[PDB]
Amino acid sequence: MNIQAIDTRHGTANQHSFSNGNCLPYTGVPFGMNFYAPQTTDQKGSWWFHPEDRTFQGYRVTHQPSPWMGDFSHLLMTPVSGSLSELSLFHAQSSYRPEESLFSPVEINLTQLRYQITSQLIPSMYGGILTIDYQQKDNHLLLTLPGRYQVKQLDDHQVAVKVINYSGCEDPDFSFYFVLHFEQPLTKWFAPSSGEDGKILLSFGNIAQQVVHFSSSFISEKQAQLNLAREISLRSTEMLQQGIADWHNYFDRLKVTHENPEHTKTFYHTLYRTFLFPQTFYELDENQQPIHYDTFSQTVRPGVLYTNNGFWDTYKTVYPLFSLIAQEKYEEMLEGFLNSYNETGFLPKWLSPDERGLMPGTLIDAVIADAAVKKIRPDLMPQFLEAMKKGATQQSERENYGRQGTLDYLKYGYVPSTYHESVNHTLDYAYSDFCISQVAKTLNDSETATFYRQQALNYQQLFNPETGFMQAKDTEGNFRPDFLDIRWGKDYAQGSAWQSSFAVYQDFAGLIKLYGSELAFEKKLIQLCNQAPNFNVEGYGFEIHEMSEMAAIDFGQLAISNQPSFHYPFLFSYIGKPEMAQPLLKQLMQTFDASPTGYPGDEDNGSMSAWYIFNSLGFYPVTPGAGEYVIGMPLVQTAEVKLSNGKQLTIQTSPNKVQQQFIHEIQLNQEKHTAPYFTHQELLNGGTLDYQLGIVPNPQTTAERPFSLSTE
Ligand SMILES: OC[C@H]1O[C@H](O[C@H]2[C@@H](O)[C@H](O)[C@@H](CO)O[C@H]2O)[C@@H](O)[C@@H](O)[C@@H]1O
Ligand SMILES: [Ca+2]
Ligand code: NA
Numbered sequence: 115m116n117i118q119a120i121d122t123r124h125g126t127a128n129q130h131s132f133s134n135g136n137c138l139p140y141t142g143v144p145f146g147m148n149f150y151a152p153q154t155t156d157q158k159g160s161w162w163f164h165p166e167d168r169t170f171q172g173y174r175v176t177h178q179p180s181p182w183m184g185d186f187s188h189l190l191m192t193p194v195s196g197s198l199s200e201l202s203l204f205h206a207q208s209s210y211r212p213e214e215s216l217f218s219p220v221e222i223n224l225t226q227l228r229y230q231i232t233s234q235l236i237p238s239m240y241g242g243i244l245t246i247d248y249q250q251k252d253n254h255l256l257l258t259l260p261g262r263y264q265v266k267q268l269d270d271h272q273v274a275v276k277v278i279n280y281s282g283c284e285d286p287d288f289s290f291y292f293v294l295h296f297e298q299p300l301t302k303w304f305a306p307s308s309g310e311d312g313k314i315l316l317s318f319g320n321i322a323q324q325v326v327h328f329s330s331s332f333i334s335e336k337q338a339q340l341n342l343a344r345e346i347s348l349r350s351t352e353m354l355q356q357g358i359a360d361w362h363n364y365f366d367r368l369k370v371t372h373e374n375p376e377h378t379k380t381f382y383h384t385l386y387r388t389f390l391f392p393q394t395f396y397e398l399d400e401n402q403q404p405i406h407y408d409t410f411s412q413t414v415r416p417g418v419l420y421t422n423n424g425f426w427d428t429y430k431t432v433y434p435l436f437s438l439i440a441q442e443k444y445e446e447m448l449e450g451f452l453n454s455y456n457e458t459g460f461l462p463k464w465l466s467p468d469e470r471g472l473m474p475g476t477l478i479d480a481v482i483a484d485a486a487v488k489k490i491r492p493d494l495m496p497q498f499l500e501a502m503k504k505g506a507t508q509q510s511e512r513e514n515y516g517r518q519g520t521l522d523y524l525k526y527g528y529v530p531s532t533y534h535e536s537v538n539h540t541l542d543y544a545y546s547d548f549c550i551s552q553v554a555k556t557l558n559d560s561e562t563a564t565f566y567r568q569q570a571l572n573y574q575q576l577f578n579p580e581t582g583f584m585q586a587k588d589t590e591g592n593f594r595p596d597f598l599d600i601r602w603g604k605d606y607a608q609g610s611a612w613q614s615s616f617a618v619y620q621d622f623a624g625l626i627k628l629y630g631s632e633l634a635f636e637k638k639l640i641q642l643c644n645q646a647p648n649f650n651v652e653g654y655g656f657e658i659h660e661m662s663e664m665a666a667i668d669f670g671q672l673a674i675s676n677q678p679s680f681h682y683p684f685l686f687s688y689i690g691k692p693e694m695a696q697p698l699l700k701q702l703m704q705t706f707d708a709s710p711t712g713y714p715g716d717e718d719n720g721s722m723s724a725w726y727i728f729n730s731l732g733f734y735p736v737t738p739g740a741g742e743y744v745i746g747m748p749l750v751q752t753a754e755v756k757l758s759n760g761k762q763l764t765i766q767t768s769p770n771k772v773q774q775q776f777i778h779e780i781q782l783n784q785e786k787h788t789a790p791y792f793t794h795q796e797l798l799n800g801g802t803l804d805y806q807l808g809i810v811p812n813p814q815t816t817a818e819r820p821f822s823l824s825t826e
Contacts, residue, residue, distance in 0.1 A: 184281030471514020475542025603653020675715025
């Protein structure tokens with residue numbers, strides 16, 4: 115699909131109480147340092163765009179990854195005509211007709227009805243071009259400069275801005291530089307000025323058209339001017355062509371077709387949201403050397419840096435997809451994440467722009483381990499192992515960094531119930547320990563590999579054979595009483611025992627043994643899927659959107675609206691019964707579409723988009739760090755996958771209509787494939803992946819199972 119037909123209002127119909135993706139209409143280049151979006155309201159906090167709004171407050175320069183993290187280093191540009199007594203966003207706001215507007219990754223185009231202005235914003239990595247067509251005779255641009263700001267007019271054609279605003283930052287004076295070069299001159303001089311919450315009305319007089327070339331920096335005003343100088347000669351049409359080519363570079367790596375073209379539209383909307391995050395957070399100096407801002411030391415440092423990622427979300431799907439088709443990006447992003455460690459002492463958890471420390475676990479360990487077993491940045495793995503061992507053995511004095519209850523986990527083999535979300539912390543630490551083990555193994559550090567492989571079995575500490583759930587446990591080894599299987603929070607993050615008891619990616623075979631048998635585990639999975647989507651709110655004291663999103667649909671406790679349940683259909687693959695989940699996976703993919711209500715829950719910076727892409731192709735990385743993809747049920751009829759190693763994997767299904775809900779047979783390069791998984795190596799060889807599909811199941815009797823520590 116051509117990038118101009120992607121509508122960025124996909125997944126934007128949200129509020130605090132209910133998510134259909136909690137996406138913004140991000141205009142930008144892939145991994146752009148800034149994104150650009152219309153702002154329709156300043157009265158709904160982080161939810162500053164709604165597709166049903168008919169009000170336009172301005173073009174917002176944003177770094178907002180989610181409404182939960184909020185924004186950093188934002189400002190607005192608002193075309194105006196005539197006098198304005200008061201410069202507030204409300205006083206300057208114009209209605210607009212959404213149905214006559216363009217919302218695309220490479221272009222925003224809309225008409226402010228109040229002013230008879232039509233304007234067009236095209237993005238670049240560090241800036242963009244805003245073209246403004248005026249019908250009236252006293253023509254302006256309003257700059258809204260939140261937080262502490264500085265602004266000056268350098269000449270008739272040049273303005274420079276600095277803003278200090280953020281939701282959370284280690285640097286209380288965290289600064290963003292923004293420069294504007296105008297084709298048509300300013301007709302009113304103003305003196306350099308500074309303040310809080312700036313409202314600056316630039317004047318151009320009676321011109322029909324203004325063209326604003328803008329750029330930006332987290333380094334300096336001088337760096338922002340160099341970023342601009344690199345593209346100042348481009349026309350809007352040339353910058354648009356370049357931005358379309360940048361997106362085509364990534365879109366061309368997954369060319370797919372479907373029986374239903376609605377499914378193809380959904381695919382490419384999700385693919386657009388797979389190459390936004392993490393955002394570029396470095397610039398190239400006068401010598402083309404990567405530099406970035408280090409909020410910890412409050413200085414400019416050398417090297418790459420990336421931002422706007424919660425690894426709790428993105429480790430699931432984004433980095434595994436990059437491992438197949440964007441290895442060059444994965445390689446540079448790992449270098450940034452290590453720089454984050456170099457600068458703070460701990461591998462990053464939630465970057466926006468710097469460590470915000472939200473969500474359980476240090477799932478960055480899975481991004482590292484998956485890369486190690488796939489031979490991505492082997493050069494960095496000794497530095498990563500040292501970083502991982504430090505996180506697994508040393509408690510940070512600052513609450514947002516590394517592991518919580520590190521020392522108690524080492525003493526007890528679990529985080530005790532006195533800690534918040536102890537079950538998640540425990541299971542995330544045991545999976546991290548598997549990940550550390552895998553990195554050690556790739557480096558032939560046998561002693562480290564062995565110790566961490568044993569630590570990875572600590573999930574067994576919270577398994578209650580009496581209930582068949584993971585439950586919180588006190589320092590004397592007693593399960594918290596008054597257990598209710600559907601009670602959310604307290605011991606579990608954003609779920610009940612049902613959304614929390616299966617985070618054992620390292621050893622499903624061992625979790626299955628705790629149940630007693632492949633059959634007793636099967637019974638639990640059937641009960642998880644086939645029950646009503648009931649919840650109890652006591653752990654929170656109120657209903658939260660993740661509960662509402664599960665209870666909105668009839669898929670039992672398989673809460674596809676949130677990351678904890680993402681792997682659930684694949685659990686059937688660990689008892690040799692993948693056929694039980696093939697229909698379920700096609701039914702789950704139908705909860706996605708290209709509309710403003712198009713996701714079942716928070717998209718989270720590529721995480722749920724890449725869930726959809728992988729499942730569309732029919733395989734899924736259950737266990738980052740194992741070098742495998744568990745087989746599911748494809749929705750495509752064809753895919754040409756351009757692998758980073760330069761080979762092509764061509765996928766072909768038999769006719770893949772609604773009634774096709776099972777896999778009959780798979781041939782990989784004309785050889786019957788019976789295993790319920792593919793190795794990463796197998797897919798990297800390229801060739802032909804043929805799925806013969808069925809209207810009834812073809813049960814396999816193969817003993818073959820995906821990776822588990824306890825059986826390797
Ligand atoms: O974007 C940050 C983080 O957001 C998630 O959780 C949000 C919100 O959805 C949830 O209701 C409350 C629970 O009190 O927590 C907020 O931080 C979370 O799903 C995660 O996916 C994401 O990284
Ligand atoms: Ca989420
Ligand atoms: Na939805």
